Amino acid sequence: SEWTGKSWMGKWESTDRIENFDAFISALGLPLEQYGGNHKTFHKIWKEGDHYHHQISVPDKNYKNDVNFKLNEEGTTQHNNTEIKYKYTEDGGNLKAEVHVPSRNKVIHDEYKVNGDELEKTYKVGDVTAKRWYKKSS
Ligand SMILES: [Cl-]
Numbered sequence: 250s251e252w253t254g255k256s257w258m259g260k261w262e263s264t265d266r267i268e269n270f271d272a273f274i275s276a277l278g279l280p281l282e283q284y285g286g287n288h289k290t291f292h293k294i295w296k297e298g299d300h301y302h303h304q305i306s307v308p309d310k311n312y313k314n315d316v317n318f319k320l321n322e323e324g325t326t327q328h329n330n331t332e333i334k335y336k337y338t339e340d341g342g343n344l345k346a347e348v349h350v351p352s353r354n355k356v357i358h359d360e361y362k363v364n365g366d367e368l369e370k371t372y373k374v375g376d377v378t379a380k381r382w383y384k385k386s387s
């Protein structure tokens with residue numbers, strides 16, 4: 250396991266800073282009663298030889314998902330039983346994920362942009378953009 254090498258690698262924790270996230274959640278067709286708000290969220294991204302791991306956790310929601318990815322290579326995961334296709338790529342120093350949710354005819358853009366000490370995550374679906382800011386853990 251390697252925890253450095255790219256600016257977006259590391260252990261990231263959500264902050265109080267969030268923008269337009271309910272509009273993004275609504276545009277995905279998800280209920281705000283269970284997916285809105287600003288619950289403490291962790292992103293951990295590290296390298297394991299020939300691939301990366303990306304662990305997402307939302308402890309209040311009993312959610313933990315470990316995503317295995319190789320840059321530029323498609324992968325799949327599941328949420329409940331919604332299949333999710335993804336492909337992570339680098340845009341220079343930033344990390345992007347292209348996400349298909351075929352059952353719902355949705356395409357989602359995720360971006361991870363590290364401004365130094367801080368990580369800005371941008372979420373886009375169609376013309377709806379949300380942002381959330383993360384800090385390095387501890
Ligand atoms: Cl498509």
Ligand SMILES: [Mg+2]
Nearest residue numbers: 290292370381
């Ligand atoms: Mg997040």
Ligand SMILES: [Zn+2]
Nearest residue numbers: 347356357358
């Ligand atoms: Zn796209």
